[PDB]
Amino acid sequence: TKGILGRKVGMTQVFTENGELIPVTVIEAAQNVVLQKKTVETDGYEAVQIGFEDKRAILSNKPEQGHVAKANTTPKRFIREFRDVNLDEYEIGAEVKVDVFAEGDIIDATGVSKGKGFQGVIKRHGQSRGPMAHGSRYHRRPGSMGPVAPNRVFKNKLLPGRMGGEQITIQNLEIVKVDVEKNVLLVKGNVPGAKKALVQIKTATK
């Protein structure tokens, strides 16, 4: 199981050798370093901690500087753990390049979905509108809060509230191209998040 951290650059399309045209997400994954290895003896579980993008000194504090000094590297914007990896691979301070993947590798992409702010039940939960005419005064409303008997509302009556900005995993995206000199992965289809969003690419759990 291999893993890397990249930024979503954007979407485009590529023609396959076949001739088919496929949509791709461009993930730029430069400056991934191995910062720490967690073992069962020390931490209670196997994981490798990867630091992604380089960050100006004045944006880092002394606690951060002390943690990346152990891996002889500069402060890092994003630090994430990968579990289910082989710790025998990964030396502390080693770069992690996008060539840990190959064209045809099936990956899971994890990121935070775009923020839509306060949203109603129609957009947030795909509920149906009431009629728009025939005397209706019920358009974009949540529906009955429930029956009478329990003198209260059950605990998953879906209602308006803040919509996106959740963690999302898309499973089984094909890697379409790996460009090491550009530190670029091309992934078939889309991954969560706005442009410039952290994307965690790891080998498909399935």
Partner: protein, 122 residues
């Protein structure tokens, strides 16, 4: 992108001039039919002396739509109108002639007799 109540020109030689879509086939709640899909339909306008008569409930394959079709190569095809061809339970047309162009998608769905009779297959 044809649904219940969508009317369609009949692109063939059988009596039917205009059909009304009664049902998109192939799924419990299937909303929409595309090029190459078979619909159940009623004949709303007939040609006097034709084989297929007004009020007859028939099956028809959609052979061109305004909502066209995407192809794997990333190209699309769209027609100026929605037309269908009345068929038997074997995918053969009730008519002897097909009028107007017909989408290549028919050849893939195995409507070979229709593809052969069509003046152009785009």
């Amino acid at each position: 992108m044809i649904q219940q109540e969508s009317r369609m020109k009949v692109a063939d030689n059988s009596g039917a001039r205009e059909v009304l879509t009664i049902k998109v086939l192939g799924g419990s709640g299937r909303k929409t039919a595309n090029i190459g899909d078979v619909v159940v339909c009623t004949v709303k306008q007939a040609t006097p002396g034709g084989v297929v008569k007004k009020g007859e409930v028939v099956k028809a394959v959609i052979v061109r739509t305004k909502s066209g079709a995407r192809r794997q190569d990333g190209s699309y095809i769209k027609f100026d109108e929605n037309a269908c061809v009345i068929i038997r339970d074997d995918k053969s047309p009730r008519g002897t002639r097909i009028f107007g162009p017909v989408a290549r998608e028919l050849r893939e769905n195995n409507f070979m007799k229709i593809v052969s009779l069509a003046p152009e297959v785009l």
